[PDB]
């Protein structure tokens, strides 16, 4: 996780998103070149949408 943080905090463009919906859309539009770390609850909900 420290290795992942080292990468995420310095990644350009920013890998951080303002809202959950923004992260979900970035995953959906990035053709698998963007993975999103989020709480299992939101993940499970979006998986059924």
């Amino acid at each position: 996780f420290d290795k992942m943080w080292t990468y995420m905090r310095s990644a350009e463009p920013s890998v951080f998103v303002r809202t959950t919906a923004e992260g979900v859309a970035r995953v959906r539009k990035s053709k698998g070149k963007y993975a999103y770390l989020l709480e299992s609850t939101m993940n499970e909900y979006i998986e059924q949408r």
Partner: protein, 49 residues
């Protein structure tokens, strides 16, 4: 130009550039305060841009 180089990956560390004076210099306090004033008034961002 010739635009043939590229920055790849994130930064390996995080640090800063500072205005330096001889140890114990009379200018140390005014120059430290001026850098903070130039920071707070947005001068440093304008000059980098």
């Amino acid at each position: 130009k010739p635009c043939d180089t590229m920055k790849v990956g994130g930064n390996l560390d995080s640090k800063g550039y500072g205005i330096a004076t001889p140890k114990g210099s009379s200018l140390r306090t005014p120059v430290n305060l001026a850098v903070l004033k130039l920071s707070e008034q947005g001068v440093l961002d304008k000059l980098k841009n």
